[PDB]
Amino acid sequence: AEEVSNKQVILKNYVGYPKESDMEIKNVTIKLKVPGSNDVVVKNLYLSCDPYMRSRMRKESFAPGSPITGYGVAKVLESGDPKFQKGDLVWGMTGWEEYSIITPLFKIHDKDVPLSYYTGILGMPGMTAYAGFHEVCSPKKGETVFVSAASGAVGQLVGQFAKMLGCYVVGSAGSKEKVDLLKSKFGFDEAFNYKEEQDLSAALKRYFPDGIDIYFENVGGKMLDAVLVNMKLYGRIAVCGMISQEGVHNLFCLITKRIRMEGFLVFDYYHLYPKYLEMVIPQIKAGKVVYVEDVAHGLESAPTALVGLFSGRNIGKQVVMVSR
Amino acid sequence: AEEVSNKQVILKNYVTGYPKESDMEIKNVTIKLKVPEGSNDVVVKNLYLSCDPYMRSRMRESFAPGSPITGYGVAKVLESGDPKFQKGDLVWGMTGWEEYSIITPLFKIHDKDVPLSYYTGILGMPGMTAYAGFHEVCSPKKGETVFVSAASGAVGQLVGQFAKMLGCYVVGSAGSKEKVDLLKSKFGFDEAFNYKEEQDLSAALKRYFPDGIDIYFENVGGKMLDAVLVNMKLYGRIAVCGMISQYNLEQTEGVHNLFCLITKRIRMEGFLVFDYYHLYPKYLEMVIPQIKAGKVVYVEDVAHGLESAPTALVGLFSGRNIGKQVVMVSR
Ligand SMILES: NC(=O)c1ccc[n+]([C@@H]2O[C@H](COP(=O)([O-])OP(=O)(O)OC[C@H]3O[C@@H](n4cnc5c(N)ncnc54)[C@H](OP(=O)(O)O)[C@@H]3O)[C@@H](O)[C@H]2O)c1
Ligand SMILES: NC(=O)c1ccc[n+]([C@@H]2O[C@H](COP(=O)([O-])OP(=O)(O)OC[C@H]3O[C@@H](n4cnc5c(N)ncnc54)[C@H](OP(=O)(O)O)[C@@H]3O)[C@@H](O)[C@H]2O)c1
Ligand SMILES: COc1cc(/C=C/C=O)ccc1O
């Protein structure tokens, strides 16, 4: 059994405005051995920085003194689990460290796409966009679609999925750079900077003169109130996230417009993952669906990457490359 | 043609905040009971008028000051330029708040072995609302837990019975002890409470639903909706029927707990009874026999005469109605 140094990113204390100083790099030794258990021993390759991670920094929560955990991409080294062997590439819950021992996780089968994608378009955020838009929104060709946080990991896919259906798509984001990207790279019909608008309702009016069939909700609050008054009869709202979290005032619109507003969790849809891959892999290979990610290098960079994600300093999907 | 005086309830002006009696008045005019030439109009004598909460929204599509209020009623046909209706037919539909109306292009009533007043409630729009809302929007299943607000009202008292009939566990809220007693002794709710006597509505619902709520039939909105959200089960459903606590506010109360839709995967869906009238033949064919057999029951509050109508309508918003509020026009 190989015994190796193992760098780790440790939660120093519960978090307040998350800062780099609440994490800490620690250097330990690890013996790369299956414990008599069903554990998988992996070398981590990529780590996802995901918004839900913030709530886990307070007290299912992270433990101070212990490594941070989250979605990543890793190589199997040893396995007591029948489903995985040495050399398998996998994605799932792993540790923020060079090597992890994982308890009883998806086998990667296509190595022809950059492997970082299995933290985003081919991982949890991609499955999130697929379940939310294709299942929860019941979309039809020619319908109008608004996407909140449109340049994030999830929303940049929702808009391309809608485009591919023949929908008219508008997105909102937090900078000129992000807006230009929405239009020029993701093929959104329109986009605006929400920070610039003094009246979100009037602005959605201008982009949707006939109303909105589908809102993919990443935000909540005032944005949700502005959407509600601009929805079409029988409009659908897929409640994915509420990252901005402020009272919502316009729920009466659910009756007058007969709107179905429905929350969902990506874990409930994992039986549809092979089918999602079946659709999106050849779209990617043909350049008809695209993805933009931010890749920080080395674990020494992971605290900075996680903190910057919480503010939106990243462009699209934030990833840390642990090792090549 | 026959000429008779025609008493009318007139809306005096648009309303801010709560409506009061003096926002309406009684006017007497002369009406000629005849079908306007070339029209397919129907001339009716009004018998029962429904008081319905959505009528508040029309006091700010909207009613016109100086003109009769209009709403759902039950009437007897006197003359008709429409071949579908004959003199002597009984109908229910939109009519005027008056002794007689000329109605331009209505459901023809066939069963008169039930009180005619029931076609303002259990056999009219509110009855269809409870059925469409509960049977269609809530996708209910045997053994599920069901919470209904404004539960002793026109729509609520039916939702609760339909839920018990399905073998659901059912809890109702109402705004007085008398209404709570009625929920439990007449309508067969498993439990009920007076929302005004609860210090903390969330803690109240947790007491009545130790494992959470599968289905919320929402008639009320506001702080009640927030207390329900944190008590919902996984894949809970909320059929958004009404938000009566909000109707008389100049600014709505903010709803704060929507993040629960995500953690609990909740479907919260609004609906309008109008969209579901294709199901009305079916509803009547199921419910009428159940009423005649005493398996479904009804409580209505019948005010007497058009002079009572302003009071009857205003009292909805104070909880003065016990069960479905009706005005008997004529005797
Ligand atoms: N239900 C589920 O199963 C599930 C699964 C995955 C993710 N989610 C949720 O989906 C949402 C988006 O996830 P993601 O992975 O795609 O995140 P992300 O967009 O990659 O990162 C966060 C983004 O949200 C926007 N944002 C941050 N603060 C904001 C604010 N105050 N107001 C408006 N926009 C703000 C940012 O873009 P701007 O430049 O536009 O500000 C930022 O890029 C999150 O709320 C997340 O928790 C839910
Ligand atoms: N979506 C549709 O197609 C449709 C059709 C019909 C009705 N509706 C809606 O369904 C609901 C019930 O209608 P209904 O005909 O059955 O009325 P109802 O319950 O017969 O009468 C109204 C009742 O609302 C309650 N109430 C009034 N103000 C309140 C407040 N501030 N907070 C809490 N409760 C209050 C009262 O009962 P308590 O004494 O118990 O407080 C009062 O008796 C309404 O919200 C209505 O707008 C919707
Ligand atoms: C018929 O009953 C209602 C209708 C509406 C909405 C009507 C919009 O066309 C709101 C509340 C009600 O009680």
From Swiss-Prot, chain A:
The molecular function GO annotations come to: 2-alkenal reductase (NADPH) activity; 2-alkenal reductase [NAD(P)+] activity
Query: Which Gene3D superfamilies does its entry note?
Result: Medium-chain alcohol dehydrogenases, catalytic domain (3.90.180.10), NAD(P)-binding Rossmann-like Domain (3.40.50.720)
List keywords of the entry alphabetically. NADP, Oxidoreductase
- List the catalytic activities from the record: an n-alkanal + NADP(+) = an alk-2-enal + NADPH + H(+)
> How is activity affected by pH?
Optimum pH is 5.4 with 1-nitrocyclohexene as substrate.
Please indicate if the UniProt record lists Secreted as a keyword: no
Q: Where does NADP(+) bind?
A: A153, V154, G174, K178, Y194, N218, C240, F264, L265, V266, N314
Task: Tell me which residues bind substrate.
Answer: Y52, Y71
Q: What is its EC number?
A: 1.3.1.102
Residue intervals passing through the bilayer:
none
Could you tell me which InterPro entries the record lists for this protein? ADH-like_C, ADH_N_2, GroES-like_sf, MDR_fam, NAD(P)-bd_dom_sf, PKS_ER
Under which main EC class is this enzyme filed?
oxidoreductase
Listed as disulfide-bonded, the cysteine pairs are none
- What does this chain do? Reduces the C=C double bonds of alpha, beta unsaturated enones, but has no activity on enones with an endocyclic C=C double-bond. Shows a high specificity for NADPH as the hybrid donor. Substrates are 1-nitrocyclohexene, 2-methylpentenal, trans-cinnamaldehyde, methyl-trans-2-methylcinnamaldehyde, trans-2-nonenal and 1-octen-3-one.
Tell me which family the UniProt entry assigns to this protein: Belongs to the NADP-dependent oxidoreductase L4BD family.
**Extra facts:** There are no hydrogen bonds between the substrate tested and the crystallized protein. The reduction of pulegone shows no sterospecificity and only the pro-4R hydrogen of NADPH is incorporated into the C=C double bond of pulegone.
User: What subunit structure does UniProt give?
Assistant: Homodimer.
What's the protein called, per UniProt? 2-alkenal reductase (NADP(+)-dependent)
Q: Which organism is it from?
A: Nicotiana tabacum
